[PDB]
């Protein structure tokens, strides 16, 4: 009773296909045609943070837009004061291969993770003045690729075992389990109201999730290769994904389609990181060819290039007030642009 189920799935796919095709009456290019361009966007590197011994995989800003954490595979989480280029903490880890780092919006906690299959929470606000491990979350069967805080007690993780998970930090137990991907999940992005999040795995698919009930709401296809980065639009009604096929793409949640593609013939390297600006007009993307291209979101134009790294750009992040952007790379340097 297998081919009949597959033909039912096929006719459901066809119904979804033409139900999406009936909604595309015009293109985003047709509508933002007469909008004025943004011009050449020139940025300057304002700080270069030094101190990591090996390549940087992850970084995350604090919600005060002054502090940022970074993770390097020499086994250190270094917290920085971006305004004064001073180190506030240097946390040694029990596993060298860290691949994700998260900053809690309260500012009290930091979470790292990697090939140890464990999400370790750290407490930056202690009595003895020592940053110690609060809890180590076990239960994933593959490596951790992404982790994002929701409160001081909840955290969502992404693993290489094709699963996302919701955790309850005070009990250490996995509450909700998000299944559905057929390849390893690489990135997460939370919605601005923390009721939804979207994941991008190495099966050329993006999926929307309900944090409350644990159900998949929508699935988005269109990329040809593995998705490596997802970011939400600042209003929560759209998101952007970067892949190994050298294209970023914009999706809507109410139209269930793709609205724009951002590609050039001179770009043949994959995309590592994706971030929007505060207005949502600029899309910043880090590439494997050591650069970072700025895009116009409502159009498909390059507004500028952030050049200055000497190895693969690994992580991007725009502050909560949009004042600056931070880039890390395998040259073991962090650069802040403005």
């Amino acid at each position: 009773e297998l081919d009949q189920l597959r033909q039912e799935a096929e006719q459901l796919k066809n119904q979804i296909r033409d139900a999406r095709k009936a909604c595309a009456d015009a293109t985003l290019s047709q509508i933002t045609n007469n909008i004025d361009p943004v011009g050449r966007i020139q940025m300057r590197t304002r700080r270069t943070l030094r101190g990591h011994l090996a390549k940087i995989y992850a970084m995350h800003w604090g919600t005060d837009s002054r502090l940022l954490v970074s993770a390097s595979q020499d086994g250190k989480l270094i917290i920085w004061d971006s305004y004064t280029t001073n180190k506030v903490h240097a946390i040694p880890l029990r596993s060298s291969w860290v691949m994700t780092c998260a900053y809690a919006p309260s500012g009290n906690y930091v979470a790292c993770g990697g090939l140890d299959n464990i999400c370790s929470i750290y407490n930056l606000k202690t009595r003895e003045g020592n940053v110690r491990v609060s809890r180590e979350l076990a239960g994933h069967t593959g490596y951790l690729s992404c982790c994002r805080f929701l409160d001081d007690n909840q955290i969502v993780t992404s693993s290489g075992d094709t699963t996302c998970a919701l955790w309850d930090i005070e009990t250490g137990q996995q509450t909700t389990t998000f299944t559905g991907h057929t390849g390893d999940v690489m990135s997460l992005s939370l919605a601005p109201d923390t009721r939804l999040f979207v994941s991008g795995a190495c099966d050329a698919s993006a999926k929307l999730w309900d944090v409350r009930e644990g159900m998949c709401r929508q699935t988005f296809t269109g990329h040809e290769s593995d998705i490596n980065a997802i970011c939400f639009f600042p209003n929560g009604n759209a998101f952007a994904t970067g892949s190994d096929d050298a294209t970023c793409r914009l999706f809507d949640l109410r139209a269930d389609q793709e609205l724009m593609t951002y590609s050039h013939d001179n770009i043949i390297c994959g995309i590592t990181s994706v971030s929007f600006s505060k207005s949502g007009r600029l899309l910043l993307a880090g590439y494997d060819d050591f650069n970072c291209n700025v895009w116009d979101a409502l159009k498909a134009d390059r507004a500028g290039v952030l050049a200055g790294h000497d190895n693969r750009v690994s992580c991007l992040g725009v502050t909560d007030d949009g004042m600056a952007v931070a880039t890390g790379s395998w040259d073991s340097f962090l650069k802040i642009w403005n």
């Binding site: 190495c202 040809e224 290769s225 190994d244 096929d245």
Partner: peptide, 11 residues
């Protein structure tokens, strides 16, 4: 059973 497979990345 013979499968048609694709390498995961262009170029």
């Amino acid at each position: 059973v013979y499968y048609c497979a694709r390498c995961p990345a262009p170029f």
